[PDB]
Amino acid sequence: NQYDVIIIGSGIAGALTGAVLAKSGLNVLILDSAQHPRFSVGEAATPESGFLLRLLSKRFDIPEIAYLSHPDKIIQHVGSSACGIKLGFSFAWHQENAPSSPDHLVAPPLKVPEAHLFRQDIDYFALMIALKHGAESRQNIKIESISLNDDGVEVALSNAAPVKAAFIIDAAAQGSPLSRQLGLRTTEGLATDTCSFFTHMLNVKSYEDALAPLSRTRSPIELFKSTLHHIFEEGWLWVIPFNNHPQGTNQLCSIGFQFNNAKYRPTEAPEIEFRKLLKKYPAIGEHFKDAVNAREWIYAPRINYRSVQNVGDRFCLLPQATGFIDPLFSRGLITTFESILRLAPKVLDAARSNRWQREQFIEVERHCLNAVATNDQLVSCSYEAFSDFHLWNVWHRVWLSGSNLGSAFLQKLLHDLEHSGDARQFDAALEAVRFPGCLSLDSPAYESLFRQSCQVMQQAREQARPVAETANALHELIKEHEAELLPLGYSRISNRFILKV
Ligand SMILES: [Ca+2]
Ligand SMILES: [Ca+2]
């Protein structure tokens, strides 16, 4: 064995994994068929993802990891082009053959700003963290085979001698070569069936300039300074600026549009589909009158997958290699950072005890598979809620209340870790949560609300129920559970901009 761990993929997941393991005394080799710099989506940070980066940073004493959670710290240390800003998620609803209303908006603001991650710069910086801590990296390589033996792993490489390790982590995405060879991936049982078209653009107009100013919308935050979701019956489109930070230099804006394949299947080239969308929804088109595409569109016809298992004696698939649902709500980054946080202490224990058995990693699998399942219910039910603004308004409080509870839970874990310095206590506290992979992590009342609300939405889809009935059923569920949630007034449906505290 020339290494302790081989990591496939040098993106943020592989890089952070490599950094924390190398920091902790393991000899790590990161392999990637691609090379930096390169484009990637997965751009909208969340409260959870920020807390998870800070937890990773504190758990392994790597300060630079925490920089990646704060836009001001990204600008200062990674570079001024490396992010935009977000003060929350905003949602504007539209329908075909009718004018769009600036009152069909919800936007619950954050207290602390978060980042729109320009992944080419963020990921390259992350790899630099790993390299500076002693992880080895080989870019632009070709893996010829991966052998999983009872005494380790052996990876054959084109035009080089094979490399050996005790353990292999797949930190790649849809191209997970372990996933392909292990036969663990499937689309069976997934409620979400969606496609995605995405690119980066110049000269994308702000929501306030294109559609309605703050004096009209009454939003507490500029939608320009938010992850903006334009939602409609068959899909949604994101507007994620990198050019909205007063000290930023990036000129681009990320644009992605997604369809529920059960309701609309695209047939034509990405630019033609984009123009058809804008004709259908002229309000959305107001962003793009002077816009130009700065890259080729990428089209993915089906973005959803899960896995039946993701750990063995000698391997672990990180979340992107295991399952993905949708960009909606940006749950992928969350699941990724939490999975690293759960896995890394176990890999260290394994390497120190020289014991490599599947059962040691079972809670990593339990978290990841539960997270993908929860993500599938969240997103599938959301796409059904896209049918009507009032329904969306009621529905978004189910997501928000859960996310707020999970964020608060992670914030508390971080506080305890910062002051106690007690890594083992933290690891055990995260593992002891009652609902790993669920939005609240540990609230039986919230998970009751989530389960029952998803049942309402699936039944509404299945039986084509009237949207007013569904919205009301959700509202009554929120009222029933509200006493056991954060005291934000989630049942006050007329307040479309739910504030913290
Ligand atoms: Ca070693
Ligand atoms: Ca994503």
Author numbering: 2 to 502
Report text from the authors:
PltM is a monomer in solution; the crystals of PltM contain four nearly structurally identical monomers per asymmetric unit. A monomer of PltM consists of a large FAD binding fold that is conserved in FAD-dependent halogenases (residues 1–389). FAD and halide were not found in the FAD binding site, consistent with the lack of color of the protein and its crystals. The C-terminal quarter of the protein is a unique helical region not found in other halogenases. The putative substrate binding cleft located in the interface of the FAD binding fold and the C-terminal region leads to a conserved catalytic lysine residue (Lys87), based on structural superimposition of PltM with structures of Trp halogenases bound to l-Trp. Indeed, mutating Lys87 to an alanine yielded a catalytically inactive protein. The C-terminal region then likely helps define the substrate specificity.
